[PDB]
């Protein structure tokens, strides 16, 4: 027990416990009476300033033991309120939760030391886990007194700290079971970089965590955090200085469950579902800044549908498509990176890690042997885009064949046989070998790659640009329209019924349902596939009818499934058939 | 918190006052039966179940589950000095102790281990997962399921090492339980005390102990991994009398106690108080693909006879393989020939391989990857890889440090382990260029020659091969021929027994057939309705194994005509000048299929109509472009 003000500080955090606001709400039915047992209470600094400013901004200036005093006061309180759950005799760290100073990883700059502050950056390096060494209820049969000894280190509190031949030489059976342990973790953050000056390199940070907070996202998302600063080691007293962060609660800033989702928003969705001609709207929703597809790109944004059998096998449910000369195909994929979740562009020139790892490690603090990640499992249960496809090498393509079609990734990097679950889709971009060409010579052989992929993909297709002398003034009219609010109220609309946010919020239920097939798809699909393989190869189109297989069925069923999710009609109809199939023809 | 005295009496009372009468004829002592079984020197480890301790008491029915390390040692010294019932010179350790006292610092009873105890929870409590062992599983005997990986072999661990000065004849007791230690100085005795009469004591394993000490690696199920995560692992130290209780590829269920670990060493990287833990266990009940769920640890005749005479057909076993589509009937039965085989002998010293290896050619939509992915599941000890899914060392052996010894041994790839079965490969052409020699080598069976160290790289692979690849741009162009449309090594194409190409031209009424075939795979989860009773996979597993053990003779009465069959074979393909190749190994092949086909007869009655199917089988295996 150091300086006597520490205990004034204990009672001053007790001085939060006056009346209904905290003596009523914040303590009691809060974790253990409600029996969630997530030890960390929820603090908000603003109320602290509104009660005790010297104890509010004493915290965001120093945190020597104010956390520990918060915890001491909490156990003193709950021991009175409900001692039954007072059996977790540890520190019980708490929130400090809640724009005073929110500088970047680039600007955690030689100050804020001894402060508790805010950071933003990239979810990255979702990394390895270990447990922690606390205190152990030793024992000696010769004397039969179960003594104790607590162990510390700097990353938990200030001070720094197994017994053998303790008293004079008597027995020591180190009793585990009543010896306790936290959970421990280490990972990092990177600046969300597009605030960068690209004359400079976006900088980095270092963060450490603790028990009931562990490993709460995947590397490749965006996040907020609010934590404190510590710096232990030698610094020419022996060699310079380093950083680390703690004292925080987690904040991911890309979810929907973050939204207060009551039974009313679903009610608006299901009310408006009855409106039939909404598909043509949602097609004209996605790309309000560009003619031109997206009726189906939507279905690609709906993942797919998974179908298994008893103790047999399983299938992949999702769709993959693409078709075009230069000049709005290399600007229609950024409707995915920043429209919808888990979207990762790739290069068109990048090797050795689309799904590879290289597994390289170099004498880790612990025994990290061999592993790195890839660029598909990041996109599990969603989507991928690429630009400049055809110029990709012919190396990693076959990995795409495998992991697309088989719907599982069961690979090895020469050290370890590996298996996982990556069940995603992908796009890319397109370029013919000879520039401005798809029509006079042939439709095919203007693309130049294996005819195996169109089975792996779905579509042999076409995309071009010009017009003759009559409609050229009509494209002039549309181009000048592209080059306000008038007459997009002739487009009977609202910026809340057609938007980005509500459009995103129609994810949850369309992906939670399982709109089973009835029966009346069957004769239609069969007769149509018959006509398809029969007479698609005549009248100027014989050579553009090669890639048909018995794979248009799984695509058709993917399509009617997806279209059955955009209005949640727990059934499937002929109108869904038309709206799903007219693309193929 | 609790006491070591009345608790001791309670557990002794449990040891004695125990005639748990679960049913009729149970009026004696179960643990007293186990006691006299110790008295037999037959049993050396009792297994314990909560039901006994469920009915006796409640503390130690919940007090031992969290500690597991004290009440067991009390159980140890409790029973160690309980002699209710020789011979002396029967056990190597005990006979060495009786050597050493017949020859004659107190000896522990820990030295005379001579018997052990484990546990067996009640209701494999639940399938707790290697991920979810969070910050409350220290010391607690938890039940969990994992997946095996990279097993090594039995090693003897040490517990007590004794020296002897050779000047005072001292028999010291230096017990050890951790990994590392140091012995004692020259004379830690009283006759060899500070008095100058001291020499230097020296170890003797004779009056010392060793213990079974196995180690394996433990990998995850890859069914409950998080959505955006990667498979993890954990380590095993399975002690006691359970070494050799797992194999690579057993979905095991292990029950033991989590514990921490102190990798003593450098005080900076280590000594950081970070707890690089490890596992401990006693009981390995592998619930998937082990001695429990697989019987015969298939030859058991009586239990299957009721179904054996219950049915009599072959095609019933035919289309029961991947029964979710229709079509390609003649492929599945011959594939089923691949699972059985069974033609083994040592005629003239030369051994004949009986593993069929066939490929799949032509893929404008055929479900090529379906048969492979299915049969690799149903076929016990199967694998699956693709063209650029693995390098040459991924297929062949490799090297890695060894936690058991560190010997830097060789570990093999997919084909290295799939012997005595079938290793499946898909999309063969784009596998690799040098890989074709790698598959050229298996045609001289049990011969995997590598140049990794390039010394010998000898290895006995007795695998089949399930090949499958695609044609290049096009599918038998009107002018193209074999080795023209395909760009595979024709020598490699030579070394197969059945070539298999799957080409589907438009059939105006077969498409609707399959459309109604596969669409019913999705409204429900079972294709064949009310037309035949397709068999369960599990009964399939034994029904295939029983056929193998026959090994019939050959009918000389048809040997006179098998050669004539080869005559018409080699002639009706020879009637044209430039048809595809017809090989002289056909007579060595036709003999190898009719045998395995008779294996499912289990009769040694290969008949004239027996090969009558094989003749049309190879007959259609070629000439697949006539119409």
């Amino acid at each position: 027990e150091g300086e006597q003000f520490i205990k004034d500080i204990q009672r001053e955090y007790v001085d939060f416990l006056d009346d209904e606001e905290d003596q009523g709400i914040y303590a009691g039915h809060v974790k253990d009476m409600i029996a969630e047992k997530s030890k960390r209470l929820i603090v908000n600094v603003n109320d602290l300033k509104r009660k005790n400013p010297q104890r509010a901004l004493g915290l965001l200036s120093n945190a020597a033991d104010e956390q520990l005093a918060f915890g001491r006061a909490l156990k003193e309180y709950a021991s009175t309120v409900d001692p039954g759950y007072a059996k977790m005799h540890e520190d019980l760290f708490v929130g400090f939760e809640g724009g005073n100073r929110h500088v970047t990883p680039r600007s955690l700059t030689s100050i804020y030391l001894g402060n508790m502050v805010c950071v933003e950056g990239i979810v990255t390096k979702v990394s390895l886990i270990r447990p922690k060494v606390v205190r152990s209820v030793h024992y000696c049969p010769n004397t039969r007194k179960v003594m104790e000894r607590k162990y510390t280190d700097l990353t938990s509190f200030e001070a720094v700290p197994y017994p053998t031949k303790d008293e004079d030489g008597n027995l020591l059976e180190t009793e585990y079971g009543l010896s306790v342990y936290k959970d421990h973790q280490t990972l990092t953050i990177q600046e969300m970089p597009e605030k960068a000056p690209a004359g400079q390199l976006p900088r980095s940070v270092d963060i450490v965590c603790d028990d009931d907070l562990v490993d709460r996202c995947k590397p490749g998302d965006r996040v907020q955090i609010v934590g404190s600063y510590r710096c232990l080691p030698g610094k020419r007293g022996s060699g310079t200085f380093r950083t680390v962060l703690l004292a925080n609660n987690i904040s991911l800033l890309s979810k929907e469950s973050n939204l207060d989702i009551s039974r009313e928003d679903i009610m608006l969705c299901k009310k408006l579902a009855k409106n039939n001609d909404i598909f043509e709207l949602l097609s004209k929703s996605l790309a309000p800044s560009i003619g031109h597809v997206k009726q189906a790109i939507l279905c690609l944004l709906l993942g797919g549908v998974e179908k298994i059998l008893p103790n047999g096998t399983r299938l992949r449910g999702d769709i993959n498509v693409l078709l075009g000369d230069p000049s709005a195909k290399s600007q229609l994929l950024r409707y995915v990176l920043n429209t919808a979740p888990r979207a990762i562009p790739t290069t068109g020139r990048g090797s050795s890690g689309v799904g590879l790892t290289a597994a390289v490690t170099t004498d880790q603090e612990t025994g990290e042997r061999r592993l790195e990640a890839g660029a598909m499992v990041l996109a599990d249960r969603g989507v991928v885009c690429i630009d400049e496809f055809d110029k990709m090498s012919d190396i990693d393509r076959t990995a795409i064949h495998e992991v697309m079609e088989q719907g599982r990734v069961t690979i090895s990097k020469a050290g370890i046989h590996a298996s996982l679950n990556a069940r995603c889709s992908v796009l890319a971009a397109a370029n013919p070998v000879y520039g401005r060409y798809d029509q006079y010579k042939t439709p095919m052989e203007n693309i130049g790659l294996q005819d195996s992929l169109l089975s792996r993909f779905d579509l042999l297709f076409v995309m071009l640009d010009v017009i003759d002398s009559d409609v050229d003034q009509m494209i002039s009219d549309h181009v000048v329209r592209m080059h306000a609010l008038l007459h997009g109220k002739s487009r009977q609309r609202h910026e809340k019924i057609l938007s980005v946010e509500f459009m995103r919020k129609y994810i949850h239920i369309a992906k939670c349902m399982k709109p089973k097939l009835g029966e009346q798809a069957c004769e239609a699909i069969a007769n149509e596939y018959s006509r398809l393989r029969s007479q698609e190869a005549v009248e100027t189109d014989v050579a553009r009818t090669q890639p048909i297989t018995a794979r248009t069925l799984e695509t058709l069923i993917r399509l009617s499934t997806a279209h059955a999710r955009a209005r949640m009609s727990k059934s499937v109809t002929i109108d869904d058939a038309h709206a799903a199939i007219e693309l193929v023809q | 918190r609790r006491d070591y005295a009345q608790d001791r009496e309670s557990i002794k009372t449990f040891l004695s006052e125990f005639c748990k009468c679960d049913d009729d004829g149970k009026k004696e002592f179960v643990y007293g039966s186990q006691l006299v079984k110790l008295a037999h020197r037959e049993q050396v480890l009792i297994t314990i179940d909560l039901d006994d301790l469920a009915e006796f008491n409640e503390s130690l029915a919940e007090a031992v589950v969290d500690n597991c390390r004290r009440y067991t040692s009390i159980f140890s010294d409790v029973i160690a000095e309980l002699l209710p019932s020789e011979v002396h010179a029967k056990d190597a350790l005990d006979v060495y102790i009786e050597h050493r006292l017949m020859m004659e610092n107190s000896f522990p009873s820990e030295l005379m281990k001579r018997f052990e105890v484990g546990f067996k929870p009640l209701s494999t409590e639940k399938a707790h997962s290697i991920r979810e062992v969070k910050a409350q599983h220290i010391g607690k005997l938890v039940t969990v399921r994992g997946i095996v990986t990279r097993c090594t072999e039995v090693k003897p661990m040490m517990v007590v090492a004794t020296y002897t000065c050779d000047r005072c004849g001292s028999e010291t007791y230096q017990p050890v339980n951790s990994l590392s230690f140091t012995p004692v100085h020259d004379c830690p005795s009283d006759d060899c005390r500070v008095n100058k009469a001291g020499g230097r004591l020296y170890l003797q394993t004779r009056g010392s102990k060793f213990v079974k000490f196995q180690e394996v690696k433990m990998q995850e199920h890859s069914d409950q991994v998080p959505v955006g995560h990667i498979p993890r692992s954990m380590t095993i130290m399975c002690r006691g009398e359970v070494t050799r209780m797992a194999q690579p590829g057993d979905h095991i269920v292990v029950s033991g106690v989590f514990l921490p670990l102190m990798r003593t060493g450098f005080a900076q990287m280590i000594q950081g108080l970070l707890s690089e833990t490890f596992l401990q266990a006693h009981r390995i009940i592998c619930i998937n693909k082990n001695d429990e769920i697989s019987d015969k640890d298939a030859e058991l005749t009586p239990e299957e006879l009721e179904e054996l005479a219950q049915d009599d057909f072959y095609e019933r076993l035919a289309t029961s393989l991947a029964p979710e589509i229709y079509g390609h009937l003649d492929v599945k039965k011959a594939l089923l020939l691949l699972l059985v085989g069974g033609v083994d002998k040592r005629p003239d010293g030369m051994k004949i391989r009986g593993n069929i290896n066939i490929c799949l050619m032509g893929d404008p939509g055929v479900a090529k990857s379906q048969l492979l992915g299915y049969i690799s599941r149903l076929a016990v000890r199967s694998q699956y890889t693709t063209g650029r899914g693995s390098s040459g060392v991924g297929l062949t052996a490799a090297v890695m440090k060894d936690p058991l010894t560190g010997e830097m041994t060789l570990e093999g790839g997919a084909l290295v382990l799939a012997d005595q079965g079938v290793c499946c490969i898909d999309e063969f052409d784009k596998m690799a260029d040098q890989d074709r020699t790698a598959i050229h080598e298996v045609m001289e069976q049990q011969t995997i020659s590598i140049a990794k160290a390039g010394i010998m790289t000898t290895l006995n692979a007795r695998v089949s091969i399930l090949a499958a690849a695609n044609p290049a741009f096009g599918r038998y162009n009107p002018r193209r021929t074999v080795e023209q449309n395909i760009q595979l090594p024709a020598a490699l194409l030579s070394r197969f027994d059945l070539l298999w190409l799957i080409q589907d031209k438009p059939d105006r009424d077969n498409d609707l057939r399959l459309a109604k075939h596969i669409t019913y795979v999705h409204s429900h989860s079972k294709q064949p309705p009310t037309r035949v009773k397709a068999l369960d996979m599990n009964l399939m597993r034994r029904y295939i194994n029983l056929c193998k053990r026959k090994n019939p003779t050959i009918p000389d009465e048809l040997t006179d005509y098998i050669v004539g069959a080869y005559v018409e074979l080699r002639r009706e393909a020879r009637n044209q000048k430039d048809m595809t190749f017809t090989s002289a190994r056909n007579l060595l092949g036709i003999l190898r299929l009719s045998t395995a086909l008779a294996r499912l007869r289990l009769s040694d009655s290969v008949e004239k109509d027996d090969v009558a199917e094989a003749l049309r089988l190879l007959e259609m295996s070629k000439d697949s472009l006539n119409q």
Binding site: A198, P288, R349, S352, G353, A373 | -
Partner: protein, 223 residues
């Protein structure tokens, strides 16, 4: 203490420093003892402002002067004759237009880009060297990339990103011989100069950074 983010790389410096060691073969280094900068015309005038109201005054008084553009079409060459319509938009290329992002995706192309090809003997090289000379820019020509820099510091064995269209993110770039450099390194630059989202996907990183650069192209046609 206060002079990080005082110098971006790619600049001309004056320096006041000191040459002192850290540990007879022992090591060198130097620090700042009160840095300042250069005046190669405006040697360091690249991010900050010690320009004064006098400078703004002179500037904007030049601006309204409606005989400045035809004045500036004769600015680059105090030694070359003619070629004025070629020159009326080698100077606008510096100035750039507008990088207008919108509520949808369309971050439309900000800068502009240049072409020229012609028989030798018309002073191509000096002109492009002059456009390099006169805010920030760099110059190569052919033989250089399609790959970016995923190397590894032999210290710690990781895959860092050293990153040089990066170095024109407000500057520009000029090259000659798009012709005589073959196609293995033209595709990354196919991409960069239409979206500026320079992507990376090699190993376990997908940090599609970006850089806003323009570009100038000389050429040589056969015969």
């Amino acid at each position: 203490r206060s002079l990080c983010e005082r110098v971006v790389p790619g600049n001309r410096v004056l320096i006041q420093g000191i040459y002192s060691i850290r540990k007879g073969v022992r090591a060198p280094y130097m620090r700042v003892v009160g840095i300042t900068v250069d005046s190669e015309g405006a040697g360091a005038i690249s991010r900050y402002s010690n320009i004064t109201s006098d400078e703004e005054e002179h500037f904007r008084r030049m601006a309204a002067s409606g005989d400045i553009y035809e004045r500036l079409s004769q600015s680059l060459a105090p030694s070359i004759f003619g070629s004025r319509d070629i020159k009326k938009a080698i100077t606008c290329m510096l100035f750039g237009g507008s990088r207008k992002r919108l509520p949808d995706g369309l971050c439309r192309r900000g800068d502009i880009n240049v072409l020229l090809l012609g028989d030798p003997g018309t002073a191509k090289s000096q002109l492009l060297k002059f456009v390099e000379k006169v805010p920030i820019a760099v110059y190569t020509s052919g033989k250089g990339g399609l790959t970016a820099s995923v190397m590894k510091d032999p210290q710690t064995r990781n895959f860092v990103m050293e990153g040089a269209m990066v170095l024109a993110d407000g500057g520009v770039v000029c090259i000659d011989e798009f012709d005589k450099m073959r196609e293995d390194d033209r595709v990354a630059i196919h991409e960069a100069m239409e979206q500026q989202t320079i992507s990376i996907a090699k190993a376990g990183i997908t940090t599609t950074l970006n850089s806003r650069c323009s570009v100038l192209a000389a050429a040589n046609s056969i015969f």
